[PDB]
């Protein structure tokens with residue numbers, strides 16, 4: 001049954017209205033998150049819990065292996081709503097270790113539709129085949145590719161005209177790359193933060209409108 005979920009919900013909401021009966025009412029007036037989370041759909045990586053954010057704090061996109069594609073209006077519309085409408089100050093690209101999307105990209109079984117989705121990670125494992133082939137176990141190749149994927153997705157978000165036009169018009173906006181350990185609960189900074197146009201290769205830079 002979905003009983004427990006409905007029951008959990010009633011208990012969660014009633015509890016919050018005790019420490020603050022205005023909590024939901026105030027928040028309903030306006031959404032003002034300062035962060036957009038782009039992360040994996042993996043059930044072990046819930047965004048809000050991992051960084052102790054409350055409702056209202058964190059705009060969230062989650063997809064298989066936290067992939068950001070320049071022709072995907074799904075993820076791009078979340079980015080654009082976050083950047084243009086909500087004016088978030090930070091995009092947290094969070095991948096994670098032991099990612100199944102990443103792992104499947106490293107191997108050769110067909111999983112169907114997702115095979116196409118994960119293509120860009122497959123391209124990544126090929127671009128870095130020399131590197132990954134000098135690591136021992138699969139677990140290490142997978143985990144390393146997880147990191148490589150995060151760094152790539154950071155670059156991808158930063159290269160969007162959405163983000164660049166934010167910069168051109170003087171909005172403060174940083175794109176961070178982090179990685180969560182499903183083994184230890186730890187959200188780690190990969191230190192690849194991009195916060196302005198000067199950090200983009202000339203070939204990806206777009207002129208202002």
Ligand SMILES: [Zn+2]
Pocket residue numbers: 040041042064065066096098099100101102
């Ligand atoms: Zn994953």
